[PDB]
Amino acid sequence: NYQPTPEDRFTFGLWTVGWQGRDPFGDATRRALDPVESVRRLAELGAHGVTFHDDDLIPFGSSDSEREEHVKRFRQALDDTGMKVPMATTNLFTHPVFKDGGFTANDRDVRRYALRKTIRNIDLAVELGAETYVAWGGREGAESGGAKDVRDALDRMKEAFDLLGEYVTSQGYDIRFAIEPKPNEPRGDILLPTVGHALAFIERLERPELYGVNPEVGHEQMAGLNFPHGIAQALWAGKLFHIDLNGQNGIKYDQDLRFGAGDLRAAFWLVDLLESAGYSGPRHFDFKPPRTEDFDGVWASAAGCMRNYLILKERAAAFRADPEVQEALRASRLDELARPTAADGLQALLDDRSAFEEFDVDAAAARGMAFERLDQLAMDHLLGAR
Amino acid sequence: NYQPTPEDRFTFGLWTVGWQGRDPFGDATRRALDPVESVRRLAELGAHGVTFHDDDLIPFGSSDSEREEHVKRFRQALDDTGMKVPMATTNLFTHPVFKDGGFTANDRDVRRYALRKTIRNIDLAVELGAETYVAWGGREGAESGGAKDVRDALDRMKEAFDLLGEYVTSQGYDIRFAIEPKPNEPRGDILLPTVGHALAFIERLERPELYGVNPEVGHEQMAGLNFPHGIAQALWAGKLFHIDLNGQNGIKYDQDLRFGAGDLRAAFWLVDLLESAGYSGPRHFDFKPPRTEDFDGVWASAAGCMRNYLILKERAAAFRADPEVQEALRASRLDELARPTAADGLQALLDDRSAFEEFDVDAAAARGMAFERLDQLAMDHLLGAR
Amino acid sequence: NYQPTPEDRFTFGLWTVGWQGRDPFGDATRRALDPVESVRRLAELGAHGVTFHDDDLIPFGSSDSEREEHVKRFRQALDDTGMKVPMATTNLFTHPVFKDGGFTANDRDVRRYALRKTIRNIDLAVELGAETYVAWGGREGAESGGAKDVRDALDRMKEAFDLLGEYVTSQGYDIRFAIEPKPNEPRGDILLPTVGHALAFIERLERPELYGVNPEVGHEQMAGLNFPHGIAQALWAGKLFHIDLNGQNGIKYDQDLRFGAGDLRAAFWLVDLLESAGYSGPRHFDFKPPRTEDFDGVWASAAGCMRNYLILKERAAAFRADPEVQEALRASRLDELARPTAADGLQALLDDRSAFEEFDVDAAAARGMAFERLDQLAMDHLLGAR
Amino acid sequence: NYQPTPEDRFTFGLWTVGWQGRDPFGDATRRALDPVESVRRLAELGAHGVTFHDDDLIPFGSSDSEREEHVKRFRQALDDTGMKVPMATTNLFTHPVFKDGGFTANDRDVRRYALRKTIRNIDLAVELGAETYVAWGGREGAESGGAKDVRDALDRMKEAFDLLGEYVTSQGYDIRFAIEPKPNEPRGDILLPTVGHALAFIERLERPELYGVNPEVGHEQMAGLNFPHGIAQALWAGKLFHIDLNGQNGIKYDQDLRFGAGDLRAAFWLVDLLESAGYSGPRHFDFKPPRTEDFDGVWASAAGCMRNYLILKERAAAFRADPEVQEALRASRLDELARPTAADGLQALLDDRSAFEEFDVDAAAARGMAFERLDQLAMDHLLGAR
Numbered sequence A, B, C, D: 001n002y003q004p005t006p007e008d009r010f011t012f013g014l015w016t017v018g019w020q021g022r023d024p025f026g027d028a029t030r031r032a033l034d035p036v037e038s039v040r041r042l043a044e045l046g047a048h049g050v051t052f053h054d055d056d057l058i059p060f061g062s063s064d065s066e067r068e069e070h071v072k073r074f075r076q077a078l079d080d081t082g083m084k085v086p087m088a089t090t091n092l093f094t095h096p097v098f099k100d101g102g103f104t105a106n107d108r109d110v111r112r113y114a115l116r117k118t119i120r121n122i123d124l125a126v127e128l129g130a131e132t133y134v135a136w137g138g139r140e141g142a143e144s145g146g147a148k149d150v151r152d153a154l155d156r157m158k159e160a161f162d163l164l165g166e167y168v169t170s171q172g173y174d175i176r177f178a179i180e181p182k183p184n185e186p187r188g189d190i191l192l193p194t195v196g197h198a199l200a201f202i203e204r205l206e207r208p209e210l211y212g213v214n215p216e217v218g219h220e221q222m223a224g225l226n227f228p229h230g231i232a233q234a235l236w237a238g239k240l241f242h243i244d245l246n247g248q249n250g251i252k253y254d255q256d257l258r259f260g261a262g263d264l265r266a267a268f269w270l271v272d273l274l275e276s277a278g279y280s281g282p283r284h285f286d287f288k289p290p291r292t293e294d295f296d297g298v299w300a301s302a303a304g305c306m307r308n309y310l311i312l313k314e315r316a317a318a319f320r321a322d323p324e325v326q327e328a329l330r331a332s333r334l335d336e337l338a339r340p341t342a343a344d345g346l347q348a349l350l351d352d353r354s355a356f357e358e359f360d361v362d363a364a365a366a367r368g369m370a371f372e373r374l375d376q377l378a379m380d381h382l383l384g385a386r
């Protein structure tokens, strides 16, 4: 009954189940978790692996010796459990030095520091076997219009990513980058605010093939955007390297609810898309167990993430396998959407009097699309009412 | 006192001052305007030119002879007034045949019809001297998840734009395309919903150099996005071919208020950016005089569009010329943002102990950015309080 | 399998299934429906009754004789089918004369006309047996700040409703009023924009007992508000006289999707609340079959409204009857929320050293609320995964 | 040139200029401020007074002796500066014990503790001379639907406020309560989310005359609502006891920008309303100097709050005094909006054939409202372009 196994490729950030519950208006409600205990508890729940920021694993300002002891304890817990580390990232947002950004801070010496902090963790990530390195520029942005010339900032952002690309290729590392967009919070506006802006930016990098996106359900929904649509565009471009799964109730602060909470029907269409397109990357949960919860609630919340994915996967598969749904898809001409508009070419199109001069516009206009019957079949399948 | 001349390059769509005031809940409050009268009235107000959809100028379903008479009357009014036609577009949204889209309609015969309708108006646009051809895919999208496979739809969208690009190059036309994004309305979600998604899509076209964006103030703000930031990214990519100016009060239906209404400070930063970057295209107003207004209100509203642009232009120029502002920009290190992070290169950066090993993180963290003083200087300039 | 009967009290506006599909950017896609056919088709689907604006039933500007013939045909179809008319309303928004409002139009003669148009339809509503009379002030509002002094407008709004209350009581009519809030569209901002503002306004009327609210799912969600929470406040105040059910995907134009579409989990909690509180009024659907649909799609969409209500009703009832859920509610102390804080009174509270001086704040802080386990049980029940 | 004096009644919370810059993703960027220094610095800037939560002034868990020393130091600084304390409030949100609320926490013993903590600070507030006591229920709410029965929670909320009302009247205190609404953050949804919901709730209290609202600019704008409209409804009801001034850029996390930032035109219409209605309460700024700023930026930001109010006050006064504006107000029939619709009464209205039978609907429909000319005059005045 919806039990995960490591083959389902579910992963969690250390910072997720480890969130102590400090928010802008309140103190922590839970004690800190040792990374080692987190790995053990997640392995017992059926997770495939964990992810980390450098500063989750190695307390900021550790000596090189303390650093090695922290990595050794962590590696021992990975070996003890079979857990993998498919993704790593850099914390370029917590420390006060990053208050105006890392890669696009106005101060040049902060920008250089941000690059050196990132490069050091890329080495560690490769050693632990990470395949994707995520960059979330949470502090890259502004609260006021004059504080940031955005063209210069984009120059600085491109420079930083180009330099990281030169570093990995000069080291022969097999790692790819994924940019994680967010429209706002903690800055008033964040640069590269959506999947689309990030995809557009990547095409201006020196080595675009090394970069993709790491979209997050809740972040696109903070702009009121359709998350499955954005994921479809990222797949279409070949750029879906990683994904952050969670829940969000509309346009407000980033809630990071467990996956399946928030917009349930969007979660259904997302799972349908990922499974139909054969996405094979990690199913990563970037979520926060609400600060109302004790530690038993934390693990119930993490378990719920995986459970909801598996239930939705079953319902989406039943939806697509149902002969009556396959018939309704043809009734709505989804098969025709997949056929070329003009494989015959431009000149044939221009000579085709059935496409314009003799096109029966009123007859085509009268045909219903039958979309509502199709959508009610999808509802019936989601609710198990079929 | 803020009087426009044709050198200011202000343009208006025929559909703007010609909007009869029909909304989803009410009938028209104004009679229709003859395109010829609109050209004359706008010329008297100081406008530079007009834009049109095919169906604004030529009633849908006109014979070829009636078509020629409509164009002739229009051309005579352009010659009488000196008005230019810098942009044209296709109406692929009003007629019922486009209820599920034009370029991405599920029905293949509608998609072919949409292409032939567009190609016919490209010819007319070139004859009238338009330099930019805008495409707003207002019906390309969905209300439900199963109605549209977005990867197939993007295939169909790319196919359509590739075919238009083949047509203009095979005809030797000097015209470029601009895609106008909108997140929603009249479809529940529209494909290519923001500037960013449109920029990303263009990079997958066969001839990307022929395509740019036509962002609209209100459309990006319907996603809660920062419009000057999005414009900066479009300029950075070299893709700002055209712009739609209006006003919008936040995340709600597309209001199309006169420019300067809605988010006043965003309008100030937009004008500052366009004028500082040397944007030389038309300043096009895509706005709707509210249906409360009679015809005297329509022309007062159109006049207000141009007036507000000119006032904001004056205030932005005073802001940037003020020595105390130039000093505050240096205090906030905007000059350092414009300098390369690591022109010395990757190896020099890696060897630079001042960038990491000996970087004084606490000292850099203590420096204030002085952004609030800078933003209050900008406020004082906007309000004429200096 | 989820079949409605008239005992379920499902009702539909004539304007819902009768929506021709005209939106701000397109012409009608469906022919008009005769009110008589609509009554017959809805009766066959299992509906309990219909609602109407005066202008849905009687074409605007009909002579008194044509008026009587229209009512007679309608009454004959009600008798033929057994359909009831539980609610009626006035169209104070379509005709151009209402472009600046009805009850709060700046022009006094329009305000008087709006009152006479309303009073005439109250008579008709009582004759057809309506118990609730709805007022949706769709044009009461403004696009700009100086156009409407809101204190004077609220004076005019109170005056209008006070006069309607005097009319019904002087006629001895057994009818109550329900105000339907909406935050925006078609005006830039609408007066009484949410359930809360409407409830507050009612308490200033001369006869508050005659007035309640008619909240609509999508309207509260256009402000990002929690619709079940708002309904709970209306029930708490004793003011839920009527309800408009539909679906909405977040903060954007009013979509009026079929009920169950949009925010599915909000629909579940709404049905749970209405059924648990014993709401006995009509379950009224104010929805628009998308303009992609032909007439077969219209009736499939209407059927889906009722189906989704019945499925959600079953799942909510199973949720509340599940012993493991009843246990989890006690684990989360929902039983304690229902017990008075200080039935012992103020002085006992002040003397109770266990409430402050000797309260163990750290122990109380450590208790988890177990909300995530509870919410996953609700998810499992909604998805039929239990 | 726009210099404040204590007669302008500008006040600041200790928590505003004292915000250390900790947000959900970062550590503090500024050291803590001694309340005494804050009073001195604000007095030098021209402020009239300060406000406080109990826990801003007295560190949580202080002994009764340390408590007295903290109050004594504070009182000495008030006497040294002439600063007043017009408002006080309780912190029922920071400590982990309040993670599920104070007055509406599911645990009864937490609810009793919350009441005793509040009552203790009411005594202190009266001793310092506060006239208004604010309650912001930031933790009263839920992230999930089953966690909170809202009808029971409203029962508990009413019980708490009724008990506070009994306490102040039994002590003979001259203090009034103001409820501060917020739609969300830090809870997923907060009870009483807008001005309207709060006004409606007050009317169910035992002693409604003791309670009013403390609206905050940014909070109503987090629901996309028109803040001047909401303030007008609160004034109309006689319930505007206090106000929180700041800035907010649309629907997103609560930014608490300095007043004048965010929606500039809304700030203009707000100042016009407050000054025209003769609001005489404090002009309180609940704002956060951005964490990019050092202490010089903090005081520049606080100074900007007062400056922007004074500039807007000047522009609104010029707008209302301009004869051409007074003429345009009559052209738009604002004078008619202020006149009764039917002072002649119901029977006269029903007998008046000019109101319906002989009303010229087409003539009334043709009259333009001239709202756009009026709004451009307001724009010209705001920008100093007249």
Ligand SMILES: OC[C@H]1O[C@H](O)[C@H](O)[C@@H](O)[C@@H]1O
Binding pocket: A015, A089, A090, A134, A135, A136, A180, A216, A244, A286
């Ligand atoms: O960059 C990795 C992560 O960093 C932070 O935790 C962000 O909140 C999250 O969105 C991001 O994915």
Ligand SMILES: OC[C@H]1O[C@H](O)[C@H](O)[C@@H](O)[C@@H]1O
Binding pocket: B015, B089, B090, B134, B135, B136, B180, B216, B244, B286
């Ligand atoms: O495509 C040209 C225009 O068409 C329609 O009028 C749209 O509303 C507008 O946004 C667009 O710019």
Ligand SMILES: OC[C@H]1O[C@H](O)[C@H](O)[C@@H](O)[C@@H]1O
Binding pocket: C015, C089, C090, C134, C135, C136, C180, C216, C244, C286
């Ligand atoms: O007033 C009755 C109805 O009128 C209009 O159709 C509105 O769109 C709807 O919201 C309202 O309920």
Ligand SMILES: OC[C@H]1O[C@H](O)[C@H](O)[C@@H](O)[C@@H]1O
Binding pocket: D015, D089, D090, D134, D135, D136, D180, D216, D244, D286
């Ligand atoms: O209750 C007083 C204050 O408490 C908190 O600081 C809130 O953020 C603010 O909105 C409120 O006004």
Ligand SMILES: [Mg+2]
Binding pocket: A216, A218, A219, A254, A255, A256, A286
């Ligand atoms: Mg997030």
Ligand SMILES: [Mg+2]
Binding pocket: A216, A219, A254, A256, A286
């Ligand atoms: Mg996130």
Ligand SMILES: [Mg+2]
Binding pocket: A180, A216, A244, A286
């Ligand atoms: Mg993330």
Ligand SMILES: [Mg+2]
Binding pocket: B216, B218, B219, B254, B255, B256, B286
């Ligand atoms: Mg628009």
Ligand SMILES: [Mg+2]
Binding pocket: B216, B219, B254, B256, B286
């Ligand atoms: Mg537009």
Ligand SMILES: [Mg+2]
Binding pocket: B180, B216, B244, B286
């Ligand atoms: Mg446009």
Ligand SMILES: [Mg+2]
Binding pocket: C216, C218, C219, C254, C255, C256, C286
């Ligand atoms: Mg609606």
Ligand SMILES: [Mg+2]
Binding pocket: C216, C219, C254, C256, C286
């Ligand atoms: Mg509605």
Ligand SMILES: [Mg+2]
Binding pocket: C180, C216, C244, C286
């Ligand atoms: Mg309705």
Ligand SMILES: [Mg+2]
Binding pocket: D216, D218, D219, D254, D255, D256, D286
């Ligand atoms: Mg706030």
Ligand SMILES: [Mg+2]
Binding pocket: D216, D219, D254, D256, D286
């Ligand atoms: Mg606040």
Ligand SMILES: [Mg+2]
Binding pocket: D180, D216, D244, D286
């Ligand atoms: Mg506040």
